[PDB]
Design an enzyme around this catalytic site. Structure first.
Site, mmCIF file in Angstrom:
data_model
loop_
_atom_site.group_PDB
_atom_site.id
_atom_site.type_symbol
_atom_site.label_atom_id
_atom_site.label_comp_id
_atom_site.label_asym_id
_atom_site.label_seq_id
_atom_site.Cartn_x
_atom_site.Cartn_y
_atom_site.Cartn_z
ATOM 1 N N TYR A 6 -69.465 13.110 50.547
ATOM 2 C CA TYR A 6 -69.787 14.524 50.303
ATOM 3 C C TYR A 6 -68.723 15.508 50.819
ATOM 4 O O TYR A 6 -67.906 15.186 51.722
ATOM 5 C CB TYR A 6 -71.177 14.876 50.880
ATOM 6 C CG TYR A 6 -71.194 14.894 52.410
ATOM 7 C CD1 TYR A 6 -70.850 16.046 53.115
ATOM 8 C CD2 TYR A 6 -71.523 13.743 53.142
ATOM 9 C CE1 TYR A 6 -70.833 16.062 54.524
ATOM 10 C CE2 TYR A 6 -71.498 13.746 54.552
ATOM 11 C CZ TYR A 6 -71.174 14.916 55.222
ATOM 12 O OH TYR A 6 -71.163 14.923 56.596
ATOM 13 N N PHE A 63 -67.317 23.157 55.763
ATOM 14 C CA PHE A 63 -67.909 22.869 57.072
ATOM 15 C C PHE A 63 -67.904 21.406 57.471
ATOM 16 O O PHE A 63 -67.947 21.098 58.659
ATOM 17 C CB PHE A 63 -69.292 23.533 57.295
ATOM 18 C CG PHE A 63 -70.389 23.023 56.401
ATOM 19 C CD1 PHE A 63 -70.966 21.755 56.595
ATOM 20 C CD2 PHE A 63 -70.903 23.843 55.407
ATOM 21 C CE1 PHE A 63 -71.988 21.302 55.753
ATOM 22 C CE2 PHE A 63 -71.944 23.397 54.548
ATOM 23 C CZ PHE A 63 -72.491 22.131 54.730
ATOM 24 N N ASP A 64 -67.848 20.507 56.486
ATOM 25 C CA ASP A 64 -67.777 19.077 56.768
ATOM 26 C C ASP A 64 -67.534 18.292 55.496
ATOM 27 O O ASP A 64 -67.936 18.711 54.419
ATOM 28 C CB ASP A 64 -69.048 18.568 57.451
ATOM 29 C CG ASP A 64 -68.844 17.228 58.115
ATOM 30 O OD1 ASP A 64 -68.161 17.176 59.159
ATOM 31 O OD2 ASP A 64 -69.363 16.221 57.612
ATOM 32 N N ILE A 80 -81.688 17.005 55.134
ATOM 33 C CA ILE A 80 -82.300 18.247 54.630
ATOM 34 C C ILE A 80 -83.005 18.017 53.285
ATOM 35 O O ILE A 80 -82.676 17.088 52.550
ATOM 36 C CB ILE A 80 -81.298 19.422 54.498
ATOM 37 C CG1 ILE A 80 -80.052 19.018 53.691
ATOM 38 C CG2 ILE A 80 -80.947 20.018 55.865
ATOM 39 C CD1 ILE A 80 -79.316 20.273 53.174
ATOM 40 N N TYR A 88 -81.177 24.543 56.170
ATOM 41 C CA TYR A 88 -81.363 24.762 57.625
ATOM 42 C C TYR A 88 -82.177 26.018 58.020
ATOM 43 O O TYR A 88 -82.326 26.314 59.216
ATOM 44 C CB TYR A 88 -80.032 24.719 58.374
ATOM 45 C CG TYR A 88 -79.337 23.374 58.354
ATOM 46 C CD1 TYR A 88 -79.625 22.392 59.315
ATOM 47 C CD2 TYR A 88 -78.378 23.088 57.380
ATOM 48 C CE1 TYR A 88 -78.969 21.162 59.296
ATOM 49 C CE2 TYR A 88 -77.724 21.866 57.349
ATOM 50 C CZ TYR A 88 -78.023 20.908 58.287
ATOM 51 O OH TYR A 88 -77.319 19.721 58.222
ATOM 52 N N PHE A 138 -72.956 21.602 48.184
ATOM 53 C CA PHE A 138 -72.542 20.248 48.496
ATOM 54 C C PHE A 138 -72.069 19.585 47.212
ATOM 55 O O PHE A 138 -72.646 19.804 46.150
ATOM 56 C CB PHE A 138 -73.726 19.418 48.994
ATOM 57 C CG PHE A 138 -74.102 19.641 50.445
ATOM 58 C CD1 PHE A 138 -73.453 18.938 51.465
ATOM 59 C CD2 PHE A 138 -75.169 20.480 50.792
ATOM 60 C CE1 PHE A 138 -73.841 19.090 52.831
ATOM 61 C CE2 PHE A 138 -75.548 20.654 52.145
ATOM 62 C CZ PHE A 138 -74.895 19.938 53.165
HETATM 63 C C1 LIG Z 1 -72.395 21.445 59.966
HETATM 64 C C2 LIG Z 1 -73.261 20.243 59.544
HETATM 65 C C3 LIG Z 1 -72.580 18.889 59.825
HETATM 66 C C4 LIG Z 1 -72.381 18.671 61.354
HETATM 67 C C5 LIG Z 1 -71.754 17.297 61.653
HETATM 68 C C6 LIG Z 1 -72.575 16.154 61.042
HETATM 69 C C7 LIG Z 1 -72.756 16.351 59.524
HETATM 70 C C8 LIG Z 1 -73.374 17.728 59.191
HETATM 71 O O1 LIG Z 1 -74.713 17.720 59.712
HETATM 72 C C9 LIG Z 1 -73.390 17.946 57.645
HETATM 73 O O2 LIG Z 1 -72.344 18.055 56.997
HETATM 74 C C10 LIG Z 1 -74.745 18.142 56.940
HETATM 75 O O3 LIG Z 1 -75.184 19.291 56.815
HETATM 76 N N1 LIG Z 1 -75.442 17.088 56.475
HETATM 77 C C11 LIG Z 1 -74.863 15.715 56.649
HETATM 78 C C12 LIG Z 1 -74.922 14.986 55.311
HETATM 79 C C13 LIG Z 1 -76.358 15.023 54.756
HETATM 80 C C14 LIG Z 1 -76.846 16.464 54.531
HETATM 81 C C15 LIG Z 1 -76.783 17.266 55.843
HETATM 82 C C16 LIG Z 1 -77.901 16.779 56.795
HETATM 83 O O4 LIG Z 1 -79.080 16.703 56.409
HETATM 84 O O5 LIG Z 1 -77.550 16.455 58.081
HETATM 85 C C17 LIG Z 1 -78.584 15.961 58.992
HETATM 86 C C18 LIG Z 1 -78.901 17.120 59.903
HETATM 87 C C19 LIG Z 1 -80.206 16.874 60.651
HETATM 88 C C20 LIG Z 1 -81.489 17.137 59.823
HETATM 89 C C21 LIG Z 1 -82.270 16.050 59.438
HETATM 90 C C22 LIG Z 1 -83.456 16.254 58.709
HETATM 91 C C23 LIG Z 1 -83.841 17.572 58.366
HETATM 92 O O6 LIG Z 1 -84.978 17.815 57.651
HETATM 93 C C24 LIG Z 1 -86.018 16.790 57.704
HETATM 94 C C25 LIG Z 1 -83.063 18.677 58.750
HETATM 95 O O7 LIG Z 1 -83.509 19.941 58.377
HETATM 96 C C26 LIG Z 1 -82.876 21.109 58.962
HETATM 97 C C27 LIG Z 1 -81.893 18.439 59.486
HETATM 98 C C28 LIG Z 1 -77.970 14.757 59.727
HETATM 99 C C29 LIG Z 1 -78.568 13.497 59.649
HETATM 100 C C30 LIG Z 1 -77.978 12.419 60.309
HETATM 101 C C31 LIG Z 1 -76.812 12.606 61.052
HETATM 102 C C32 LIG Z 1 -76.223 13.869 61.148
HETATM 103 O O8 LIG Z 1 -75.091 14.127 61.867
HETATM 104 C C33 LIG Z 1 -74.465 12.974 62.490
HETATM 105 C C34 LIG Z 1 -75.092 12.484 63.791
HETATM 106 O O9 LIG Z 1 -76.045 13.129 64.296
HETATM 107 O O10 LIG Z 1 -74.629 11.428 64.268
HETATM 108 C C35 LIG Z 1 -76.812 14.939 60.481
#
Ligand SMILES: CC[C@H]1CCCC[C@]1(O)C(=O)C(=O)N1CCCC[C@H]1C(=O)O[C@H](CCc1ccc(OC)c(OC)c1)c1cccc(OCC(=O)O)c1
Length: 128
Positions: free
Chosen positions: A45, A55-56, A75, A101, A118
């Site tokens: 992604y 951002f990533d 998310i 978020y 994304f």
């Molecule tokens: C600025 C966001 C970055 C920060 C560094 C890690 C990746 C990042 O989180 C990202 O690019 C992102 O925004 N992602 C990652 C790819 C998938 C889509 C999104 C995400 O859902 O990341 C989760 C964030 C935690 C989360 C989980 C469930 C949620 O709803 C049920 C939720 O709602 C607000 C938030 C994620 C999951 C697993 C790992 C992670 O980062 C790596 C780690 O913690 O080792 C980040």
């Protein structure tokens, strides 16, 4: 740019049809079927704020991002989007804060009430 294209041309894939998650298929996948809920999915992604600021990206660490589909490990927009994809597909998603978020954000990089772009490539998936 790419966010604006999704705004203008994207399909609304929400259950509520509230424009909360909009999608454009950029590359059709050769895979036959969508993943099942629970399956292990492998993605690459790029994540940008609505304004286009990066951002990533998983391509920065040369490592696919791996999660179980439909289990709330990511998310809501991701659970929604990836569920519609076939193996090999690249899509662009635009995600309102309700499906990302919310007011909390993901500080410092993702502010309160952000709409997120994304690009997701579904590299592979394996049955739960
Ligand atoms: C600025 C966001 C970055 C920060 C560094 C890690 C990746 C990042 O989180 C990202 O690019 C992102 O925004 N992602 C990652 C790819 C998938 C889509 C999104 C995400 O859902 O990341 C989760 C964030 C935690 C989360 C989980 C469930 C949620 O709803 C049920 C939720 O709602 C607000 C938030 C994620 C999951 C697993 C790992 C992670 O980062 C790596 C780690 O913690 O080792 C980040």
């Amino acid at each position: 740019g790419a966010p604006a294209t999704v705004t203008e041309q994207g399909e609304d894939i929400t259950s509520k049809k509230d424009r909360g998650v909009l999608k454009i298929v950029k590359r059709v996948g050769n895979g036959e079927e969508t993943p099942m809920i629970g399956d292990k999915v492998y993605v690459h992604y790029k994540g940008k704020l609505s304004n286009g600021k990066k951002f990533d990206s998983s391509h920065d660490r040369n490592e696919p991002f791996v999660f179980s589909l439909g289990k709330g490990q990511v998310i809501k927009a991701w659970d929604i989007g990836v569920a519609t994809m076939k193996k090999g597909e690249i899509c662009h998603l635009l995600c309102k804060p309700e499906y990302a978020y919310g007011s909390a954000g993901s500080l410092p990089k993702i502010p309160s009430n952000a709409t997120l772009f994304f690009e997701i490539e579904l590299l592979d998936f394996k049955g739960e």
